[PDB]
Amino acid sequence: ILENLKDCGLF
Amino acid sequence: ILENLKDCGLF
Amino acid sequence: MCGTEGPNFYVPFSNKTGVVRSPFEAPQYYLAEPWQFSMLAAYMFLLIMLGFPINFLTLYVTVQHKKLRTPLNYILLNLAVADLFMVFGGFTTTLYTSLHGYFVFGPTGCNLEGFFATLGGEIALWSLVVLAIERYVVVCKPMSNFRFGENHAIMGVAFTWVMALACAAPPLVGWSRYIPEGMQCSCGIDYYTPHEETNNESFVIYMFVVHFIIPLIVIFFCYGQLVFTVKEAAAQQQESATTQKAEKEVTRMVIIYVIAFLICWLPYAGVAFYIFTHQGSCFGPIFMTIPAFFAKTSAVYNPVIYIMMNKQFRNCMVTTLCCGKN
Amino acid sequence: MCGTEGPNFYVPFSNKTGVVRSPFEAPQYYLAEPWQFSMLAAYMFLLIMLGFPINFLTLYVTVQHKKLRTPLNYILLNLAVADLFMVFGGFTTTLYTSLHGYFVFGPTGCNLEGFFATLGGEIALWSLVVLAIERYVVVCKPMSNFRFGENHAIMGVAFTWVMALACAAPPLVGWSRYIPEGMQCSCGIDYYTPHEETNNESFVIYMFVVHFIIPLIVIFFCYGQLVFTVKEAAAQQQESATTQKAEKEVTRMVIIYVIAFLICWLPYAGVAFYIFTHQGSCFGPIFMTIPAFFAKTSAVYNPVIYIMMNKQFRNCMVTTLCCGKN
Ligand SMILES: *[C@@H]1O[C@H](CO)[C@@H](O[C@@H]2O[C@H](CO)[C@@H](O)[C@H](O)[C@H]2NC(C)=O)[C@H](O)[C@H]1NC(C)=O
Ligand SMILES: *[C@@H]1O[C@H](CO)[C@@H](O[C@@H]2O[C@H](CO)[C@@H](O)[C@H](O)[C@H]2NC(C)=O)[C@H](O)[C@H]1NC(C)=O
Ligand SMILES: *C/C=C(C)/C=C/C=C(C)/C=C/C1=C(C)CCCC1(C)C
Ligand SMILES: *C/C=C(C)/C=C/C=C(C)/C=C/C1=C(C)CCCC1(C)C
Ligand SMILES: CCCCCCCCO[C@@H]1O[C@H](CO)[C@@H](O)[C@H](O)[C@H]1O
Ligand SMILES: CCCCCCCCO[C@@H]1O[C@H](CO)[C@@H](O)[C@H](O)[C@H]1O
Ligand SMILES: *C(=O)CCCCCCCCCCCCCCC
Ligand SMILES: *C(=O)CCCCCCCCCCCCCCC
């Protein structure tokens, strides 16, 4: 998920 | 110098 | 019987002393010492001070940086713009009027000031909602083969605008109404007066339900789902320390998002309710200010939480602020 | 003839209208509209808001973190403590008195409020000086075989205290004096009135010379030397990109340190001087406020520059603020 997490700025 | 620089918090 | 009534207002004071004057007309120094009007102003200043930079900088940085201009970021810009209405439409107006001790701009003034201050804070709210929905979609991948694009981002934003008009516009044309609230220097929605000629009673609920509980639920669902999805993916991948951090840090944030959300809208819902359900009850003009104190400060702390604490955005600030370098 | 005189004060207004009252006695709403007193208060609030956190947090973090408790950091703690006197001794007092419109605590009030507000800001100044001296010693290695220890750090601090008393104490016992300055809600040193019974003329210079130019020079020397030493070491070591950054970033900071220092003390020196050298000249009570506006805000921006921008300190804040983690 870490990819999408980044796009959302959540991680 | 980079050592002392660090101790002073300047770099 | 607690307050004073007039055509377009309601003063939380007993005119048995014969001292009560229209808030469109004279200083309400009987409602509260003048120095308390000063502190009100002090505050409005504060929120302008912090709130205008923080929020404005957000648009600015989004200009210097190409990496910020992504669909998943649109709603966040909505969020800052909203906050700016909250500043210029509310905070600054109220700084001026507070300094007179009454709502100098009359009822039209009250309608505008009320409308933008209200519009602004609802866009912000629905931003926060739309946001969580997108993050849920993108991450919980609830619809298969679905990728979130610019055209969704656009509706996302539009939808907050429509939602927000759905609440700020009614009072301007008969369903509920705008009146100087609190110490009468600002103008909010009417939700404490049972003013039949406009059906405050009903709007109040519709407000409560559509504009509080819906959001509350959605936001809690979407983020629950997400703190679920990510907590699961972590378990299924212990071997990774990064995925371990991610899941841990994503939780920490969603807690914040939520806590901070109750802090903003709980007071108004808490009061609106308690008032609705204790109709024979007198409420101070300072105490009537409490719920609005919380709701306004979010124009500072929402940027901080959803923007300054957002990894992407933060960098470009520190970069921009520290002069192109660092 | 421009002002009004009294035993222990000087009001920047012409009592030909017969309206001027002692600032220890009645609101000076003729000196300035009341709303301008409100804005004064608004400000004092601001500086308390930002200034008290920032500075207090500095002590706090230095407690949670063992890596901060080093000799090269003592003077920085001095700096925060100073700022706190500036807050509680000055900022908050002035918030109270501003809200009355006159210096309610009388002359003793004026002596205290003046003394701590003045003591505080001089420790801060001399901190900034002592600091640059230490950084020069440690880095320019001007004395061979010399290592800076805790026992130097201690004097360093003591010396700022002595220096500071050397300026705040005289006015309390006859050389110059403390009087409500500006819009008369705060109490500064007397430097614009030629009050022979206390020799303001002389102290003013001694102030100007010892407590401005000395610092100014020292600070400029020590940092010049240092931006020298480091610019040289960089050249002599091109092969290193890190030493390249260091020298580049060290310059950027020393520029700031300096710019920011003039911003703080230039106005008071600029005014003190222009007044000394245009003795037949009338100066507004708002304009008399300008120099002090700059000098007080440093209780916000000095922590930011010398502490929040200090790499060590910053980490432990972000750590402490974000709850043990990050
Ligand atoms: C609150 O107090 C007074 C007394 O009831 C009201 O003011 C009077 O209004 C009439 C006109 O309607 C005037 O001729 C009197 O001179 C007023 N008296 C005083 C002392 O002001 C006032 O209207 C009431 N306020 C509200 C909001 O209705
Ligand atoms: C400024 O204005 C007035 C007039 O010169 C001064 O007040 C008078 O003071 C005497 C006592 O010394 C009183 O009996 C009068 O009643 C006062 N007049 C008024 C209108 O207040 C006042 O002292 C002057 N202020 C200063 C700072 O000296
Ligand atoms: C500064 C003034 C502002 C931001 C006023 C805003 C007031 C609201 C958005 C009130 C709305 C609500 C109720 C009236 C009752 C239930 C809770 C809300 C948030 C839906
Ligand atoms: C808030 C009030 C404060 C901090 C007042 C401070 C005023 C001074 C420290 C004034 C000192 C100076 C002069 C009077 C003239 C030359 C410049 C200074 C800084 C030495
Ligand atoms: C939308 C509502 C989201 C609620 C999220 C609640 C998350 C609670 O998350 C917590 O995470 C810790 C690890 O980080 C665990 O040790 C705790 O047991 C767990 O309760
Ligand atoms: C105490 C006073 C210190 C003054 C320091 C002035 C430093 C000016 O430093 C600047 O550094 C740049 C590289 O970073 C160079 O390109 C400029 O030529 C140089 O003027
Ligand atoms: C480009 O590199 C500029 C870098 C340095 C910016 C330093 C900013 C310090 C701001 C301190 C707080 C100032 C405002 C206080 C208001 C009351
Ligand atoms: C531990 O991890 C806590 C982490 C989150 C702290 C979030 C703080 C947000 C503060 C926003 C500004 C609040 C004050 C506004 C005053 C007018």
XYZ file of N, CA and C in Angstrom, chain C residues 133-239:
321
model
N -13.156 10.162 2.185
C -13.745 9.334 1.129
C -12.741 8.971 0.037
N -12.039 9.966 -0.502
C -11.014 9.702 -1.504
C -9.932 8.787 -0.948
N -9.391 9.129 0.210
C -8.357 8.302 0.807
C -8.809 6.859 1.014
N -10.089 6.687 1.273
C -10.653 5.368 1.456
C -10.680 4.655 0.119
N -11.222 5.323 -0.888
C -11.289 4.775 -2.232
C -9.914 4.331 -2.733
N -8.975 5.272 -2.719
C -7.614 5.063 -3.219
C -6.854 3.944 -2.484
N -7.097 3.808 -1.191
C -6.304 2.903 -0.388
C -7.008 1.579 -0.073
N -8.270 1.643 0.324
C -9.023 0.428 0.610
C -9.445 -0.262 -0.680
N -9.163 0.384 -1.811
C -9.466 -0.163 -3.137
C -10.813 -0.892 -3.166
N -11.870 -0.206 -2.733
C -13.168 -0.860 -2.529
C -13.814 -1.228 -3.855
N -13.582 -0.411 -4.877
C -14.058 -0.696 -6.216
C -12.869 -1.199 -6.990
N -12.989 -2.388 -7.573
C -11.865 -2.967 -8.301
C -11.643 -2.256 -9.628
N -10.396 -2.316 -10.087
C -9.983 -1.727 -11.357
C -10.247 -0.227 -11.436
N -10.490 0.397 -10.281
C -10.755 1.835 -10.220
C -9.547 2.688 -9.812
N -9.201 3.656 -10.665
C -8.136 4.618 -10.370
C -8.668 6.047 -10.303
N -8.305 6.732 -9.223
C -8.754 8.091 -8.956
C -7.993 9.122 -9.805
N -8.720 9.829 -10.675
C -8.138 10.838 -11.548
C -8.546 12.279 -11.287
N -8.040 13.195 -12.104
C -8.339 14.619 -11.959
C -9.842 14.873 -12.012
N -10.556 14.107 -12.823
C -11.971 14.388 -12.991
C -12.802 14.038 -11.755
N -12.277 13.147 -10.924
C -12.929 12.841 -9.658
C -12.595 13.954 -8.681
N -11.321 14.325 -8.637
C -10.866 15.404 -7.762
C -11.752 16.631 -7.911
N -12.049 16.986 -9.161
C -12.916 18.115 -9.503
C -14.323 18.012 -8.894
N -15.050 16.937 -9.188
C -16.330 16.723 -8.517
C -16.158 16.791 -7.010
N -15.209 16.026 -6.485
C -14.933 16.055 -5.062
C -15.100 17.466 -4.528
N -14.383 18.406 -5.140
C -14.418 19.810 -4.750
C -15.781 20.461 -4.976
N -16.324 20.279 -6.175
C -17.644 20.798 -6.485
C -18.635 20.356 -5.408
N -18.641 19.063 -5.136
C -19.528 18.513 -4.142
C -19.432 19.212 -2.794
N -18.231 19.591 -2.359
C -18.131 20.358 -1.113
C -18.830 21.726 -1.243
N -18.718 22.342 -2.420
C -19.356 23.623 -2.697
C -20.855 23.569 -2.664
N -21.403 22.571 -3.330
C -22.833 22.317 -3.284
C -23.302 22.035 -1.851
N -22.767 20.998 -1.209
C -23.007 20.770 0.217
C -23.020 22.042 1.069
N -21.966 22.847 0.926
C -21.819 24.100 1.671
C -22.912 25.114 1.344
N -23.211 25.332 0.065
C -24.346 26.186 -0.288
C -25.642 25.637 0.308
N -25.799 24.318 0.288
C -26.975 23.677 0.872
C -27.212 24.034 2.352
N -26.268 24.735 2.963
C -26.416 25.114 4.357
C -26.330 26.635 4.590
N -25.506 27.316 3.808
C -25.311 28.753 3.977
C -26.396 29.591 3.272
N -26.946 29.044 2.186
C -27.945 29.735 1.370
C -29.377 29.764 1.954
N -29.873 28.634 2.486
C -31.223 28.646 3.074
C -31.538 29.862 3.980
N -30.690 30.139 4.983
C -30.907 31.249 5.906
C -31.037 32.586 5.198
N -30.449 32.696 4.010
C -30.507 33.945 3.250
C -31.858 34.123 2.592
N -32.647 33.056 2.526
C -33.938 33.134 1.842
C -35.112 32.508 2.584
N -35.005 32.359 3.900
C -36.199 32.086 4.669
C -36.171 30.895 5.581
N -35.290 29.947 5.299
C -35.207 28.787 6.180
C -34.027 28.958 7.136
N -34.381 29.126 8.402
C -33.527 29.788 9.368
C -33.140 31.221 8.915
N -32.181 31.831 9.613
C -31.785 33.211 9.321
C -30.454 33.569 9.989
N -29.802 34.633 9.509
C -28.548 35.082 10.126
C -28.751 36.209 11.138
N -28.163 36.094 12.317
C -28.329 37.134 13.311
C -27.058 37.266 14.116
N -26.711 38.483 14.536
C -25.544 38.611 15.410
C -25.679 37.618 16.543
N -24.705 36.740 16.701
C -24.780 35.749 17.745
C -23.749 36.172 18.757
N -23.732 35.467 19.883
C -22.712 35.636 20.899
C -22.757 36.979 21.595
N -21.667 37.730 21.492
C -21.617 39.082 22.030
C -22.040 40.082 20.961
N -22.641 39.555 19.897
C -23.273 40.327 18.825
C -22.314 41.072 17.893
N -21.045 40.685 17.861
C -20.137 41.308 16.901
C -20.035 40.488 15.619
N -20.361 39.196 15.700
C -20.408 38.350 14.506
C -21.810 37.834 14.284
N -22.053 37.297 13.098
C -23.385 36.884 12.698
C -23.436 35.439 12.280
N -24.025 34.594 13.119
C -24.190 33.181 12.826
C -25.581 32.735 12.411
N -25.733 31.440 12.184
C -27.026 30.857 11.853
C -27.842 30.910 13.117
N -29.167 31.018 12.975
C -30.044 30.965 14.141
C -30.449 29.539 14.498
N -30.058 29.112 15.695
C -30.257 27.738 16.098
C -30.611 27.664 17.573
N -30.825 28.808 18.201
C -31.113 28.795 19.631
C -32.438 29.500 19.916
N -32.889 30.248 18.921
C -34.174 30.917 18.943
C -35.164 30.092 18.150
N -36.349 29.861 18.733
C -37.378 29.055 18.068
C -38.257 29.962 17.228
N -37.739 30.431 16.106
C -38.372 31.525 15.376
C -39.266 31.033 14.231
N -40.481 30.642 14.588
C -41.424 30.010 13.663
C -41.532 30.622 12.256
N -41.414 31.936 12.130
C -41.611 32.540 10.815
C -40.588 32.055 9.781
N -39.559 31.332 10.246
C -38.476 30.802 9.385
C -38.117 29.316 9.632
N -38.710 28.725 10.668
C -38.651 27.282 10.885
C -37.297 26.837 11.379
N -36.674 27.697 12.168
C -35.414 27.370 12.815
C -35.386 25.951 13.369
N -36.440 25.570 14.085
C -36.563 24.224 14.647
C -36.176 23.114 13.649
N -36.737 23.182 12.448
C -36.483 22.159 11.452
C -35.046 22.239 10.919
N -34.681 23.374 10.321
C -33.330 23.589 9.813
C -32.277 23.120 10.790
N -32.411 23.544 12.043
C -31.562 23.067 13.131
C -31.310 21.575 13.091
N -32.364 20.790 12.891
C -32.224 19.330 12.821
C -31.500 18.940 11.545
N -32.038 19.403 10.424
C -31.447 19.136 9.140
C -29.968 19.458 9.169
N -29.635 20.605 9.745
C -28.255 20.919 10.084
C -27.624 19.811 10.880
N -28.161 19.577 12.061
C -27.619 18.568 12.940
C -27.374 17.242 12.228
N -28.335 16.827 11.421
C -28.303 15.490 10.846
C -27.412 15.414 9.609
N -27.787 16.151 8.563
C -26.995 16.195 7.331
C -25.608 16.810 7.532
N -25.524 17.893 8.263
C -24.270 18.560 8.346
C -23.458 18.272 9.547
N -23.885 17.328 10.362
C -23.030 16.832 11.416
C -22.900 15.329 11.388
N -23.997 14.624 11.611
C -23.911 13.184 11.730
C -23.449 12.458 10.495
N -24.029 12.758 9.357
C -23.480 12.231 8.111
C -21.947 12.319 8.082
N -21.395 13.549 7.996
C -19.944 13.720 8.048
C -19.293 12.828 9.106
N -19.691 13.028 10.356
C -19.186 12.243 11.471
C -19.093 10.758 11.159
N -20.192 10.203 10.663
C -20.222 8.783 10.328
C -19.251 8.461 9.192
N -19.509 9.031 8.018
C -18.635 8.836 6.872
C -17.166 8.871 7.290
N -16.727 10.018 7.791
C -15.364 10.161 8.280
C -14.918 9.019 9.179
N -15.739 8.632 10.144
C -15.374 7.503 10.985
C -15.308 6.163 10.242
N -16.287 5.921 9.390
C -16.227 4.739 8.575
C -14.944 4.754 7.756
N -14.849 5.680 6.803
C -13.747 5.676 5.856
C -12.418 5.531 6.523
N -12.200 6.233 7.618
C -10.909 6.097 8.258
C -10.765 4.785 9.008
N -11.828 4.317 9.662
C -11.799 2.994 10.263
C -11.338 1.968 9.236
N -12.071 1.899 8.124
C -11.763 1.010 7.000
C -10.295 1.021 6.665
N -9.743 2.228 6.657
C -8.382 2.472 6.231
C -7.388 2.047 7.290
N -7.665 2.382 8.544
C -6.803 1.935 9.623
C -6.964 0.435 9.751
N -8.036 -0.085 9.167
C -8.181 -1.525 9.050
C -7.236 -2.064 7.975
N -7.552 -1.747 6.723
C -6.749 -2.130 5.565
C -5.236 -2.095 5.807
N -4.757 -1.014 6.407
C -3.329 -0.825 6.625
C -2.801 -1.624 7.810
N -3.637 -1.806 8.817
C -3.241 -2.626 9.949
C -3.124 -4.084 9.505
N -3.992 -4.478 8.573
C -3.992 -5.833 8.031
C -2.758 -6.086 7.179
N -2.569 -5.243 6.164
C -1.399 -5.303 5.290
C -0.071 -5.319 6.053
N -0.038 -4.667 7.197
C 1.131 -4.713 8.054
C 1.383 -6.076 8.631
N 0.320 -6.714 9.077
C 0.404 -8.006 9.713
C 0.905 -9.006 8.732
N 0.469 -8.836 7.500
C 0.629 -9.810 6.444
C 1.987 -9.626 5.858
N 2.711 -8.686 6.440
C 4.010 -8.287 5.970
C 4.835 -7.819 7.132
N 5.034 -8.677 8.105
C 5.855 -8.347 9.244
C 7.299 -8.149 8.861
N 7.710 -8.802 7.797
C 9.102 -8.861 7.448
C 9.586 -7.466 7.192
